[PDB]
Write a protein that binds this ligand. Structure first.
Ligand code: MG
Ligand code: MG
Ligand code: MG
Ligand code: MG
Ligand code: MG
Ligand code: MG
Ligand code: MG
Ligand code: MG
Ligand code: MG
Ligand code: MG
Ligand code: MG
Ligand code: MG
Ligand code: MG
Ligand code: MG
Ligand code: MG
Ligand code: MG
Ligand code: MG
Ligand code: MG
Ligand code: MG
Ligand code: MG
Ligand code: MG
Ligand code: MG
Ligand code: MG
Ligand code: MG
Ligand code: MG
Ligand code: MG
Ligand code: ZN
Lengths: 64, 71
RNA sequence: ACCCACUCGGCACCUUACGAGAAAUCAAAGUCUUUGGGUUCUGGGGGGAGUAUGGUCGCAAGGCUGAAACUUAAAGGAAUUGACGGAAGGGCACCACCAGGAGUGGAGCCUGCGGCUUAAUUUGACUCAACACGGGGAAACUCACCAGGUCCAGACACAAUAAGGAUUGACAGAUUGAGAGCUCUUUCUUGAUUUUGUGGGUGGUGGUGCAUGGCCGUUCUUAGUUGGUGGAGUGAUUUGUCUGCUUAAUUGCGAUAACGAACGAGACCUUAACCUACUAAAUAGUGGUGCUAGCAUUUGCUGGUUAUCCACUUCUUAGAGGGACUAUCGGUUUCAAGCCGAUGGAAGUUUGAGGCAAUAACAGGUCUGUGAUGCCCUUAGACGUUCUGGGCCGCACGCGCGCUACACUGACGGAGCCAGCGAGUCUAACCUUGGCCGAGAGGUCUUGGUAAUCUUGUGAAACUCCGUCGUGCUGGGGAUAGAGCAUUGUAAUUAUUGCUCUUCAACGAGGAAUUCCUAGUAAGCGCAAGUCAUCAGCUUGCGUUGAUUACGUCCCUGCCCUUUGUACACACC
């Protein structure tokens, strides 16, 4: 399916003197920019990065 | 393939003949004019067109074919 | 005699490489552009050729010595990647086998291919990867073929003819298959649109698919392709991408001069499965209630009523979510990836089935799908086109796909009586309910539907039930043929199809061989759709009934991988 989503194809027949040749163009658009669909490949697996903690500290409690 | 056959005799075409035609009026002793060959009474053939004389046959060529007036 | 240490001198092997090499390799092939220890011998691009000639040795065969003219741009070495093998080792698969199923191969016919025949029987394609394929079911059309008849739709440019008319058409007759003015008779009409020629175009199911595009098929039911940083190598390259294991998978684990990644696989997408949870529905349906029929009556049972009202969304529909991740537990395994079993679960074989699908190869098929196309051919007595008629169906025969059968697990006759995927008429005659008529096929009058609304609950067929028949070519089987009736169409003859009576063939389970297949699958069974005016024994799908037997291996066949040889690289054609 990402094919249907992200690549655009086109063939054109260019007609010269000795015969004809076919042009075949492929473009793969950046999925991150997709704007109106999947913003990535189904492949993509992003892990969010944890934060270095400064734990310890025996109890304590705030008041409000 | 093959090329050519034929038991002879090729068909020709048409001529449309010659004729320095329209002499078929008669202009008299200066200078009355009397049209030979009677003309055609169709709403589409304004009297300028004439009838050809065959046998029985008088015929409006102007009507590309049509109508068969006979006297 | 044996064991240990040492030492001269041998035959060799192992490991490294400081060092050498174009490399393969090499304790010499090292101590060489930082070029000299002593000495012998041979080579100077390839052929011509170890040939000619002379000398010499020999019994001979022949040995030694040994040219040139001429020719030629390479020949040659080592290593690398491919490609290929009638070498070796592993794998994988019902287009392989095992265990079996159902068959085809034998018969009748249907249908394609060959062949023959023919005016013509248009044509492409010939192992898997040609032969119910070209969506190719051809009565005209299609149509390309054959017998014949018209027309130009011959742009444009130059020139010629020529308004004293370039050219156009025609009624009747003749002619013609023809109510074609094709041609001819005859004599009007037309008015610069043509006609003649040259040039240039134009069309063409003409040729070339060994000139091409595009598309498609095949290799492939396959698992392969690449780059960064590091390692090896002068280099092309290699390692990564690998012994093993594992997987449907270069799928992973693991080993590891590699580490970490990208294409392809996977993911993804579609469809089939589960939602008494969510949003709803007179184009889906349920319960209640009104109105109402039948039977029972003691409340009951079974129906009717596109709106008489009320409520719901279980069933139907389709939006949004949810669900499974081989989960839990266990056995096995390098307790690795994984495989196996039990439980649970709608679901645990990639959940089932598909869509998509890298790099590369082929002189695979297609110029007959294209107003896609180069080149060649042809272009008015046409290979353009159209009209009439025939032909693609022609029948001693060979080959393939099929259909129907040889019956009693059946045929026939009554009766039961249940799907799913579809499709349908506007400037038109498509899907057809209902009513009559008709033995049937059909006819006729009306009708609903541009459709979850009507056809249609598509009341399909196998199937189930009670009967007749009773193993007899029988009432199994229905080829062939006669005679009538209807439908489609302008047209049915070489019988389009449908119906009725009659006729009643081969075939008594099929030699050698050969095909497909592992679960709602095989096989049986119909239906819708494509084609379609009319014609399915074809296909694409669909649901209905529903098994036997594996759950393995490498014997056969096919392919893929490694190792290995190569003088191939236009690559064993
Ligand atoms: Mg080699
Ligand atoms: Mg077997
Ligand atoms: Mg058998
Ligand atoms: Mg050919
Ligand atoms: Mg014809
Ligand atoms: Mg010309
Ligand atoms: Mg010419
Ligand atoms: Mg053409
Ligand atoms: Mg080709
Ligand atoms: Mg091609
Ligand atoms: Mg299989
Ligand atoms: Mg280097
Ligand atoms: Mg490799
Ligand atoms: Mg529901
Ligand atoms: Mg269970
Ligand atoms: Mg070829
Ligand atoms: Mg083509
Ligand atoms: Mg044919
Ligand atoms: Mg076939
Ligand atoms: Mg019956
Ligand atoms: Mg009657
Ligand atoms: Mg209506
Ligand atoms: Mg009998
Ligand atoms: Mg019978
Ligand atoms: Mg049909
Ligand atoms: Mg067909
Ligand atoms: Zn007239």
């Amino acid at each position: 399916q990402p094919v249907n989503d992200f690549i655009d194809t086109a063939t054109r027949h260019v007609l010269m003197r000795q015969g004809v040749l076919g042009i075949k163009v492929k473009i793969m658009r950046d999925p991150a920019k997709s704007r109106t669909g999947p913003k990535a490949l189904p492949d993509a697996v992003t892990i969010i990065e944890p934060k270095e903690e400064e734990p310890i500290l025996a109890p304590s409690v705030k008041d409000y | 393939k093959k090329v050519y056959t034929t038991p002879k005799k090729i068909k020709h075409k048409h001529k449309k003949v010659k004729l320095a035609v329209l002499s078929y009026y008669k202009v008299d002793a200066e200078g009355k004019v009397t049209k030979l060959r009677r003309e055609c009474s169709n709403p589409t053939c304004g009297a300028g067109v004439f009838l050809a004389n065959h046998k029985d046959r008088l015929y409006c060529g102007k009507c590309h074919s049509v109508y068969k007036v006979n006297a």
